[PDB]
Design a protein around this ligand. Structure first.
Ligand SMILES: CC(=O)N[C@@H]1[C@@H](O)[C@H](O[C@@H]2O[C@H](CO[C@]3(C(=O)O)C[C@H](O)[C@@H](NC(C)=O)[C@H]([C@H](O)[C@H](O)CO)O3)[C@H](O)[C@H](O)[C@H]2O)[C@@H](CO)O[C@H]1O
Ligand code: NAG
Ligand code: NAG
Ligand code: NAG
Ligand code: NAG
Ligand code: NAG
Lengths: 172, 326, 325, 172, 330, 173
């Protein structure tokens, strides 16, 4: 996809993650699971809702065709009216169809970026205290607590706190 | 060791969108913005019924074709429905001049009130009661005439004298009215009905002038008539006065309409039912909250935008890539 | 404790906002408003050329030569026309000016007219040219008068109304806009006193135009105490075309006409003042003095004006999202 | 924001950086301060100016309404003209308003990408001679002089020159 | 030296540029021009149907049967009509063809006409058919002639122009396009000379149409050495309809008329001097043939057939490849 | 560019890479050459071809101007025809020209993205078994023969396999 994460370096989505668009999967000696990242999920929902509403708002004017009759000496103006009405029909059909194709492209990109950006946020916190497996997964070189997992998710991860444990594990 | 992974939502959606880059992309969430469904009937708009013209055309109604008596009084409408196969229109052959502007003026209205504009006693010294024809039967009388017009003819006596009439619109509403000019097929009918000599129909208001004389000739038979009537219409503005003056061949205004002023005239088969709508198209009712519709460009009320598209589905969720289960 | 270098972005005191598809009311460091919503409520010169103020006259009153429109009378050049809504001097003798809307359109297309005598009164032999006045058409100094551009030809004291004839060959560069009429008496009595007895006609023709009309006698409702009417007419004699006039009676004759010179033309119906100022873009509701791309002032304008849209603001972000501390 | 830097991992802007859109904040023993990155800022100004000017140029044509008069037998053509002029008004009002919403979204993303690309530019110079903190800031593992900061801003930073000093403290 | 792997992109010798919102004149490796600016300056056949070349005749001269237009006389079939800007042979006896614009509009939208005698000269009784000729309308062969589709009827040596009547009933499946006229003498003298004395009229009716006109006698500026005029008229007699003609005098009577077939194509009337050649086209504009795959064209808004969309643009080139940054060599 | 790779941290294009839009350049004891990344090139080609055909498809209606004549009493309706036809001409000229400027910007960005993602794909396989030279180039800290090169291009690079060799060499410098 253009940021390379969705159906990219993260090969598939998670049906078990049901409470948001973007998220974390963790596995602990205390258990495992799928938890949405609420902030990026909600920001995305507000943005996408706004986009939908803006489009609806912008599209809320109508051209109105009319039922007028024309006589057998009014071929020119009758045809003028037809070409005019068909003309606006073609312009609005074009506007709506193109807009949908373009906005869908860009909406999928936005989702892809939001996933990419979460992944980058974790990678910079962990540094060499974790090993990058593929598929957007990190394996810690140290024991990672539920409390430690939450710190990674909320951006407070203490890299010094586990540096020595990690190094000893890393090249043991 | 312990894992933490980053990822995205998937679900069992099989609903697809198209993109500039790609077609048939399954997404977790999406919204269809277009309505393709309609109720094939006519409903009330603003809790106001449409006027069904039934077996009558707009011409047959508003001139008062004898077979349109069902429609004869006052009418209030949210829109007009004219049936394509309506057979009662202009019964005595001839042209309703500026037909199309008449039809556009009538469609602009929401109400009319029928009233006697010129009583038959207006026209002194002429015969007000013989003006019927086999071209215009009612359902019970073989010879009749338009309810809104009087076909004046000379008295048993030899001469048709100058007749005159005035109506002053002291009302607050414009008046839609009608008259005509009879064109006999030969000079023998002209002399029987009207006196010898050049005949004229003249009318004027503050802003209008009209003058016409009979164009005597035989036209192909239509409803057994080789003669013709030229029909006319006008609108008498509030404060305006109408003078009428003729010495023959006048089809006089009798009854007219106080006229009250987006409207529509739908030519359609569809039934009018005891139902309410906010959006009425010529091919049916839209009962929707969608932004676009491909039903029809012709409507009344509050409708979504017409486009030729089959579907306008917006991705809202993300590309759906659910894990494969065997 | 270690030295640091940080990557970052501008912020400032801006509280100017834009909307995007994703988000409304986003404060941004720099932006440009593309729409103009302000105007000078007045009429100015366009291309250093003044407009024509018709004042108390309608367009009809002006070019027919209504006696009370004399201040207008003669030669005019204009960048656009201003007709005042309550102007009272128009068609003074009741009647219809045929193809009026199309006349208004042709006049609107013009930039200048030169008035000249097309048919001197001596053109018509055997008839009276000095008596064609009416109390329906007063000037400011006489109760009974007539249009300056027309002659109401009447019977001589004796001999009836003869066939009268006139021609005019347009040798000029310019098309000629001219006017005439047919009088329609209320009575056969008025008909007989003004014109002869007998069937009357008014006939006109050029290389490409034919006109024929005879009077239609009836009493119309009284307007300016007149129950009679005039049918007024206008046409345009192309360069090189000749006009022939022939009438039995009931002719209201062309007398003066206009050499007419023809961009975008404007007849503004407005009460706004005309001031000694000068402008590039004149709207029916005022001057735009602006470099903006869009305007929400009016769709009706002359000059080089920004595009009309119904928008209240069209502000483009140029800077970034403003996130000051 | 889509590239995740503006109002993102770089949480706020700098009222102190007056002479550019994007740039640098340094701190060292000699002081602290701000400096715009002249090249990316100018390249952005150039692109944004071109966009603004393209939009104005494409919007240059005008539809002209006329106010001809129509008689009481010209209701149909009168209405035709009205619907025609209102139809073009609605199309241009739509074109202009949608284009502004779309282009504002993309311009904000452009700025976001430029900041992100600047961050990655520095990151790849510094390598492990500095620690990447979460926030677009790099803490040096050596002493960085005003000359040294300039070299970073310049793209001429010398990694081998400081590699041994950095290792000492990176493990010291 | 240590083993290397590098990531990069294609470049080539392309010098073709595009514009974007952010930047003008970007050289790219691959692109598509979407707009066609090339045309063949000629008229070609459209549904394997040749257009009608009116040559030195105008549309009026053609369907009235101007004697100098006999090349076009008879049945005609066409995909469109080409009218030369300086054709000389139109209305030869001066006067107006009433509702001309709407007739020209009706004739475009036709794909074929069959000429036929509608009213034989015998139809009119007690009048002279054969004196109806003028100096204004020469054929190429004869100095004095008249339109092939009209009869200028004149009173005989007998003082009286009688009432004449004519009927034509359309039992056909096709509308009939037909013409008539009303002659306006310069003089009451010429009026007396040619027709009866007293009030004259031309009355015509169908089941849906009426017509009545009387002569309007006056001297007009000389055209083609004529101060008189003819009012010309046209109408369309629908399938199943009947026409009645009745006249006192001053009738220019319908003689030949046209069975008319309306078309399922646009169709078009082009005013132009371009050559018509034995070629086929899919897209015919008024200034030439487009023979193209492109989406847009800047040649003309006026066309018949399937053409790309008309725009004012000079070029509409879409980038498909990337920014082209080839190695500088020296 | 928006993603900063094309005409960016990778300065120039390769005229020698003839079989794709995006690719690898390699050098080892065995030899040197160019090779397109087939998968990303073909996905871009499909996406861009779809874009072109979608634009062509959405633009495949025509406004039709007409040849009708108007008389000297038809100035208003003659002008109405003119303003109407010109009005649609201006709208479609605007649509086409604006669309082309916008899509050209976005198409160039898409290419920039595909290069950057290809670079990041390699970078993350190699970890510290290779050194970043500038300009999108990596020097391996170990011997990397043709099968090793291909594994990088394939996505199958074996970092543990080479981690000892590359660590020893990384020290010695
Ligand atoms: C009948 C005739 O010849 N009478 C003499 C006039 O012709 C002549 O006036 C001149 O008329 C010239 C036009 O002559 C034709 C014509 O070709 O237009 C001759 C035609 O045979 C005649 N046809 C019919 C059916 O009448 C035709 C027609 O009458 C007119 O078009 C109706 O106006 O006229 C030409 O216009 C000269 O300019 C004009 O002087 C007069 C004067 O010498 O004498 C008559 O004896
Ligand atoms: C026209 O032809 C049909 C068939 O002969 C006939 O019934 C009809 O009466 C004709 N019209 C007239 C007016 O004779
Ligand atoms: C905002 O900034 C401008 C330029 O720095 C300054 O001139 C102005 O005084 C400031 N506005 C306020 C908050 O008054
Ligand atoms: C009018 O004058 C011009 C030039 O003097 C002349 O050529 C033309 O014949 C005249 N028109 C007529 C028919 O009198
Ligand atoms: C770059 O930095 C040096 C000090 O590192 C300085 O003297 C020089 O002027 C700077 N100039 C550049 C690279 O433009
Ligand atoms: C290229 O640039 C020239 C001026 O540099 C300009 O005239 C032309 O319009 C531009 N066109 C393209 C796309 O190359």
């Amino acid at each position: 996809g253009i940021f390379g994460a969705i159906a990219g370096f993260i090969e598939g989505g998670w049906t078990g993650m049901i409470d948001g668009w973007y998220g974390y999967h963790h596995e602990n000696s205390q258990g495992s699971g799928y938890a949405a990242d609420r902030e990026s999920t909600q920001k995305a929902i507000d943005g996408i809702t706004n986009k939908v509403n803006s489009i609806i708002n912008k599209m809320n004017t109508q051209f109105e065709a009319v039922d007028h009759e024309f006589s057998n000496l009014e071929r020119r103006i009758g045809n003028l009216n037809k070409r005019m009405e068909d003309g606006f029909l073609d312009v609005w059909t074009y506007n709506a169809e193109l807009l949908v194709l373009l906005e869908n492209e860009r909406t999928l990109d936005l989702h892809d970026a939001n996933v990419k950006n979460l992944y980058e946020k974790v990678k910079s916190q962990l540094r060499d205290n974790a090993n990058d497996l593929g598929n957007g997964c990190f394996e810690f070189w140290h024991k990672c607590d539920n409390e430690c997992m939450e710190s990674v998710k909320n951006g407070t991860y203490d890299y010094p706190k586990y540096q020595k444990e990690s190094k000893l594990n890393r090249q043991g | 060791g312990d894992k933490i992974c980053i990822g995205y939502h998937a679900n069992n959606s099989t609903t697809q969108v198209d993109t500039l880059l790609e077609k048939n992309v399954t997404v977790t969430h999406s919204v269809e913005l277009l309505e393709n469904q309609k109720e094939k009937r006519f409903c009330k708009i603003m809790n106001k019924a449409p006027l069904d013209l039934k077996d009558c055309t707009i011409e047959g109604w508003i001139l008062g074709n004898p077979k349109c008596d069902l429609l004869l009084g006052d009418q209030s409408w949210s829109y007009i429905v004219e049936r394509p196969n309506a057979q009662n229109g202009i019964c005595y052959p001839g042209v309703l001049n500026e037909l199309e502007e008449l039809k556009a003026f009538i469609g602009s209205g929401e109400r009319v009130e029928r009233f006697e504009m010129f009583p038959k006693s207006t026209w002194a010294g002429v015969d007000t009661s013989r003006g019927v024809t086999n071209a215009c039967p009612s359902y019970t009388i073989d010879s009749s005439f338009y309810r809104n017009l009087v076909w004046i003819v000379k008295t048993d006596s030899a001469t048709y004298p100058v007749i005159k009439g005035t109506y002053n619109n002291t009302g607050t509403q414009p008046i839609l009215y009608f008259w005509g000019v009879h064109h006999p097929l030969d000079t023998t009918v002209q002399d029987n009905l009207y006196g010898s000599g050049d005949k004229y129909v003249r009318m004027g208001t503050e802003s209008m002038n009209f003058a016409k004389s009979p164009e005597i000739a035989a036209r192909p038979a239509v409803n057994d008539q080789r003669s013709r009537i030229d029909y006319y219409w006008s609108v008498l503005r509030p404060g305006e006065t109408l003078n009428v003056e003729s010495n023959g061949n006048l089809i006089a205004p009798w009854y007219a309409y106080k006229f009250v002023s987006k409207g529509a005239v739908f030519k359609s088969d569809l039934p009018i039912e005891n139902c309410d709508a906010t959006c009425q198209t010529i091919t049916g009712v839209l009962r929707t909250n969608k932004t676009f519709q491909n039903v029809s460009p012709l409507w009344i009320g509050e409708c979504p935008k017409y486009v030729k598209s089959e579907s306008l589905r917006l991705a809202t969720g993300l590309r759906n890539v659910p894990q494969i289960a065997t």
